[PDB]
Design a protein around this ligand. Structure first.
Ligand code: ACO
Ligand code: ACO
Lengths: 317, 317
C-alpha cells in the first residue's frame, strides 16, 4: 500500500458512494464544484493498493480571507476521510490522517477541525458516521456539540402571514441592489457570509436566489433560497438526490441586529418560503442550524433531519 | 375544543403525514396493523375543533404478558402524540397528555415511557422530534440515552464469509423447526422476543422470514429478515416508503449465550444478508440498536440512520 496525492475525482466519488452514498449521495458535479472552487491551500491524499484507490483524505489550511476576516493560518480542516469498507481496521485511516496532519502542522496549523471548512461537505462529524467519533477521539480530537440540517415539505402546509407593521418590504433581489446588499453585509455579517456572497455570485448564484428585506430603501436582511433551477449547488441542496423532484432549500438568513426580535426574521422566512411554494418546491432543507434556533424554523413545519458533531484537535506544542 | 376518543384511522394518518410524514411516512396498512393487533389496554384520544381533528395521543397500559414475562401494570406508554402544526403552543398537547396520564395513573401506572411499547412506532423520542424533548421534560420525563435504526444498501458491497468451524449450520426456517425455535427462545430470549415470535406468526410472518443457526440439530440462534414480499410489516420496514424499490430489513438477531463471542453472530448476520442480497434487496434497515452494538453491523456497511431518545416519567406518590 502507498499513500500519495490523487485528483481522480471519479474514483474518489465512486468510493464515496459505495461506502456512504445511502445517506450522503455524491455526484461529480458537486464534488468538483466544491473541491475546485475552494481557494484555501488544499490537497487530496489517497491510499492505494497498486492501481486501486482504497481510501482518501481531503484537507485544507485557512490561507484565504473570509470577508473582512483575515485568514488564520493556525486553522486546518479535515474536509472528509473515507477508508473503503473492505479495508477497515488495518491502520489506513490512521496513516492518511497522520499524513494530512503532519503537513498542516509543518505549515503552521495548531487547531484541526472536522468539517466546517469553506466549500465543506459536512458542518461536523455526521451522526451517520457516529462510530468515527471514536477514531477522532483516539487521535486527540475533542467532541463538542451538534448542528442540524432541517427538512420540511413546503407543499403540504399553509401558513398565515406574520402581521406586517408598515414600512418593511420583502422582495427578490435585483442587480441594482448589489451595492446595498454588500454594505449591509460589511455592517452585520462581514465574515464568512460576506465572503460567500462574493464567491457565490462568481460561481452561478443569481439574483433570483436572494430575498431581501428593506425598511424604506435600506437593506435590513436577506435570505438565500434554492430550487432545481439554481446554478450553484449550495449546502441546502447538497443531498438533493434524497429530496425528490422539485427539491429546494434555504440558508443562510439574517436580519440587522438593531431590527431583531421584532418579528421581522419570521416575516422574511415566511415570504421566502411562499416564494419557494409558488416555485412548486416540495421537500427542502435548511442547513447547518444550531439547537437554540430550531423552533424558529419548526413553526413552519421543519424538523431536524441530519445531525453533525463539531470536533477539534489542539496540536500539542 | 373538545378532547374525546377517536378511531378515525384515516384522519389520524392524514394528520400524522401532514405533520411528520417527510421523515416518518405513515400508511393505513401499518397504522391499523399496529393499533388493532396490540393486546394491551389501549386508547386513542383526539382533540377536536368541531368536527376537525387537530391532534391525538395513543397510549397503553402493560396488561398482557410478554413471553414468560408477566405484564407489569405499573408501566404505561405514550405510543405517539401529535398536535397539528397550525394549532401549536395553545396547550392542546398538554391537555391530551394530561388526559392519557390521568387515566393510566388511575389504573395503577407509576412509570410512563415514551414509545418502546409493543407494536410501537418509535423506540423512543425521535431525533426529528428533538424539540418535543423539552415538552416531555416540562412534564416530568427524564431523558436517557439513545437507540438507532441503521441503514445499508446490500447490493453495493460484497463480503467474504467468516471462516466456518465445522458443525454450525445456517438456514432458513421450516415448519418442523417451530418447536426447537420456541424451546431455544424460552431458554435464551423468553421475554418480548418470544412473545413477538408467537404473535408475529399469528399476523403473517412466514418461515421464509426466519434464518436459523444450529450446532448439529440444536437451534442456537436466529434472525428475522424482511423484504417486499413479507406479509407482516415489522419494525425494520416501517419506513419502507423511504427505502425505495426492493427494500428490506433485519432484526432481531440472537445467539445462545454459551455460544457468544466465537464469531457465530457474525456468521449468522453474514448469511442472513446474503439471503437478502439473493432476494435482490437493496436498501434495508436494522431497527432499534444500542450504541455499543453498532460496529457489529457497521462491518457490513450499515450506518446509523435514525436516532431515538429513551425517556421515562416516574409518577409521584
Ligand atoms: C470529517 C469527516 O470526514 S467525518 C466522517 C468520517 N468518515 C467516516 O465515517 C466514513 C466511514 N468510516 C471510515 O471510512 C473509517 O471507519 C474511518 C476512516 C473512520 C477509519 O478508518 P480505518 O482505516 O478503519 O481506521 P484505523 O484502522 O486507522 O483505526 C484506528 C483506530 O481508530 C479507532 N477506530 C476506528 N474505527 C472505529 C470504529 N468504527 N469504532 C471504534 N473505534 C474505531 C480504533 O481504536 C482503531 O484501532 P483498532 O483497529 O486497533 O480498533
Ligand atoms: C412518544 C412520542 O410521540 S415522541 C414524538 C412527539 N411528537 C412530536 O414531536 C410531533 C410534533 N410536535 C408536536 O406535535 C407538538 O409540538 C407537541 C405534541 C410536542 C406539543 O404540542 P403543543 O400543543 O404545541 O404543546 P403545548 O402547547 O401543550 O406546550 C406546553 C409547553 O411545552 C413546552 N414545549 C412545547 N413545544 C415545545 C418546543 N417545540 N420547544 C420547547 N418547548 C416546547 C413549552 O414549555 C410549552 O409552553 P409554551 O407554549 O408556554 O412555551
Amino acid at each position: 500500500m502507498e499513500i500519495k496525492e490523487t485528483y481522480d475525482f471519479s474514483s474518489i466519488v465512486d468510493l464515496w458512494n459505495k461506502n456512504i452514498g445511502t445517506v450522503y449521495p455524491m455526484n461529480l458535479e458537486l464534488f468538483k464544484q466544491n473541491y475546485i472552487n475552494d481557494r484555501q491551500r488544499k490537497k487530496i491524499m489517497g491510499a492505494f493498493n497498486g492501481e486501486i484507490l482504497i481510501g482518501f483524505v481531503i484537507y485544507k489550511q485557512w490561507t484565504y480571507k473570509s470577508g473582512s476576516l483575515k485568514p488564520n493560518h493556525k486553522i486546518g480542516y479535515i474536509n472528509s476521510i473515507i477508508v473503503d469498507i473492505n479495508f477497515r481496521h488495518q491502520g489506513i485511516g490512521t496513516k492518511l490522517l497522520d499524513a494530512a496532519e503532519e503537513e498542516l502542522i509543518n505549515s503552521g496549523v495548531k487547531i484541526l477541525r472536522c468539517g466546517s471548512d469553506t466549500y465543506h461537505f459536512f458542518p461536523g462529524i455526521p451522526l451517520e458516521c457516529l462510530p468515527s467519533e471514536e477514531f477522532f477521539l483516539v487521535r486527540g480530537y475533542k467532541m463538542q456539540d451538534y448542528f442540524y440540517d432541517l427538512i420540511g415539505d413546503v407543499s403540504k402546509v399553509d401558513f398565515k402571514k406574520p402581521s406586517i407593521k408598515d414600512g418593511f418590504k420583502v422582495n427578490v433581489m435585483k442587480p441594482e441592489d448589489r451595492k446595498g446588499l454588500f454594505e449591509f453585509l460589511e455592517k452585520s455579517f462581514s465574515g464568512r457570509w460576506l465572503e460567500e456572497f462574493i464567491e457565490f455570485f462568481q460561481v452561478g448564484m443569481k439574483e433570483r436566489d436572494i430575498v431581501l428585506i428593506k425598511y424604506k430603501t435600506s437593506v435590513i436582511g436577506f435570505s438565500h433560497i434554492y430550487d432545481n433551477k439554481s446554478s450553484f449547488i449550495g449546502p441546502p441542496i447538497y443531498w438533493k438526490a434524497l429530496l425528490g423532484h422539485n427539491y429546494g432549500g434555504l440558508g443562510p438568513i439574517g436580519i440587522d441586529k438593531t431590527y431583531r426580535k421584532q418579528g421581522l426574521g419570521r416575516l422574511l422566512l415566511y415570504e421566502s418560503l411562499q416564494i419557494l411554494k409558488k416555485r412548486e418546491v416540495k421537500k427542502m432543507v435548511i442547513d447547518w442550524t444550531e439547537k437554540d434556533i430550531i423552533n424558529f424554523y419548526g413553526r413552519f413545519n421543519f424538523m431536524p433531519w441530519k445531525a453533525y458533531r463539531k470536533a477539534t484537535k489542539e496540536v500539542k506544542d
